[PDB]
Amino acid sequence: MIQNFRVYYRDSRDPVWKGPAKLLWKGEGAVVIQDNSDIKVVPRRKAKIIRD
Amino acid sequence: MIQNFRVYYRDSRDPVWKGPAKLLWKGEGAVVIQDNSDIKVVPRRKAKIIRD
Fold first, then answer.
1. Which of A14, B1, B7, B44 is most exposed by smallest CB count within 10 Å?
2. Domain containing B45 — which CATH number?
3. Does residue A44 sit in helix, strand or coil?
4. Residues A9, A46: contact at Cβ < 8 Å?
5. Which domain holds residue A36?
């Protein structure tokens, strides 16, 4: 049950972090999120779980 | 709460279906699954929800 949680992540075109995203799937060292209208997979090592 | 469900999917190298997979995320016309030890996203139009 994920309440209001946000996630930041780095892109492959730039080691800088990217805007916040929505946390959907959560299990091993991987987290599925959604920034625009497209869901993608991001290694947990390149994502950070922030609270809202 | 996904009980025991399997999913088949076509690869981009061949329009033929691929072995069964595990159903994890389920929402819009997209379904996250896991065949080997790697989770990926597959359009619902290229996946089929089978029961186990």
1. B1
2. 2.30.30.10
3. helix
4. yes
5. 1-52
